[PDB]
């Protein structure tokens, strides 16, 4: 078992900056090291093979170098679309192995979330349920917290959050928060509020509606 140790685990780099990834083989693998780029929801795609050969269609900014046990991938001027998990592998000898991957994030200027709130659909209410949804869209950095309030009191239970992958064009994140109540609960209370706490503001960024 040849161990490929890949560094760093993750990194965050601004557009235009030079990016360095390394891969260390536990024994001599000559030049039989390749790098793969894997964008969100996609298969890995070959970038570099034979340590230093760019594959067809791979832009000039990606270069590989190295031999024996030391291997490097460099992006000379990282672009927004380059966000991906990057993987090295050796195909010198069986069993074939891969490094642990590098999650490349794009660093950009802070952006405040834009918040939208949505009452339960009439369809869902007819069925006996009531979900209140809040989208927090296009913010940076990824760190964010949401607080739900019903008639001025915090509500912690029944909340399900989900974050998108970083956007490949504008380098932001978005987040969905869903508060699920029973229909009886929902028809009881009047004011529903989601409050986003993010670095871009010292106060919560809030959105609410009155059911009545």
């Amino acid at each position: 078992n040849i161990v490929m140790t890949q560094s760093p685990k993750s990194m965050s780099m601004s557009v235009g900056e030079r990016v360095t990834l390394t891969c260390k083989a536990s024994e001599n693998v000559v030049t039989y090291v390749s790098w793969y780029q894997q964008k969100p929801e996609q298969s890995p795609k070959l970038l570099i093979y034979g340590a230093s050969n760019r594959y067809t269609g791979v832009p000039d900014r990606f270069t590989g170098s190295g031999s024996a046990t030391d291997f490097t991938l460099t992006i000379s001027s990282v672009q927004a679309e380059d966000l991906a998990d990057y993987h090295c592998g050796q195909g010198y000898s069986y069993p074939y192995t891969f490094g642990g991957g590098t999650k490349l994030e794009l660093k950009r200027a802070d952006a405040a979330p834009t918040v939208s709130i949505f009452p339960p659909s009439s369809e869902q209410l007819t069925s006996g349920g009531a979900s209140v949804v809040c989208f927090l869209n296009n913010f940076y950095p990824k760190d964010i917290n949401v607080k739900w309030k019903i008639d001025g009191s915090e509500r912690q239970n029944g909340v399900l959050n989900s974050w998108t992958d970083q956007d490949s064009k504008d380098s932001t994140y978005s987040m969905s928060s869903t508060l699920t109540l029973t229909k009886d609960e929902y028809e009881r209370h009047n004011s529903y509020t989601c409050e986003a706490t993010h670095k871009t503001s010292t106060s919560p960024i809030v959105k609410s509606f009155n059911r009545n």
Binding site: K45, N137, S174
Partner: protein, 218 residues
């Protein structure tokens, strides 16, 4: 060159699943075909390879006796059987071609998502999310679609049948008590909606669900 992989599978613990990789655009017997595992939030793990010409296989020691590779030369197709399945085996499985003996994976399949679970297949409810009632005064408007209470993954959401793609955020599904929930937002100019129609289209192939919910003003 295409490696076309079979669709997603829900299988119960202890059973086996056999997934396929149908190749085209080259002579199947001339290249070894390999399989690679990727669990969600992990790195790649090589399972093994098979030479279709000779039938010769090489396996990772971690997948000896878990995976079995075969080919069908007549249909230019490679297969991987995975046995004694557990939730540890829930993952995306890629097939990939190695370029001759140069030890690099040049062509990859789209992957096959295998879910190993005792939980039962359930159709989603699909709910349109129109904005809060009343006058809006912003230049833009945001709509949503909520897809709740389904199993297993995947579902596919678009908006008007994929012709509306910019300004869309589709949030990864989250699992709670054996049921997934997923949502999607779409942001357009206020002069676009409600004057022009906007639909949510959801499919959940596992339950034969195909639903279109037009977003209507409250």
């Amino acid at each position: 060159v295409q490696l076309q992989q079979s669709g997603p599978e829900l299988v119960k613990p202890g059973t086996s699943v056999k997934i396929s990789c149908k190749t085209s655009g080259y002579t199947f017997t001339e290249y070894t075909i390999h399989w690679v595992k990727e669990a969600g939030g992990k790195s790649l793990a090589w399972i093994g390879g098979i030479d279709p010409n000779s039938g010769g296989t090489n396996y990772s020691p971690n997948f000896k006796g878990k995976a079995t590779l075969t080919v069908d030369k007549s249909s230019s197709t490679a297969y991987m059987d995975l046995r004694s399945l557990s939730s540890e085996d829930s993952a995306v499985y890629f097939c990939a071609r190695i370029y001759h003996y140069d030890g690099y994976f040049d062509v990859w399949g789209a992957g096959t998502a295998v879910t190993v679970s005792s939980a039962k297949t359930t159709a989603p409810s699909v709910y349109p999310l129109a904005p809060v009632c009343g006058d809006t005064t912003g230049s833009s408007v945001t709509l949503g679609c909520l897809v709740k209470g389904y199993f297993p993954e995947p579902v596919t959401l678009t908006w008007n049948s994929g012709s509306l793609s910019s300004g869309v955020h589709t949030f990864p599904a989250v699992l709670q008590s054996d049921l997934y929930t997923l949502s999607s937002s779409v942001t357009v100019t206020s002069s676009t909606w409600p004057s022009q129609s906007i639909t949510c289209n959801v499919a959940h192939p596992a339950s034969s669900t195909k639903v279109d919910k037009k977003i209507e003003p409250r």
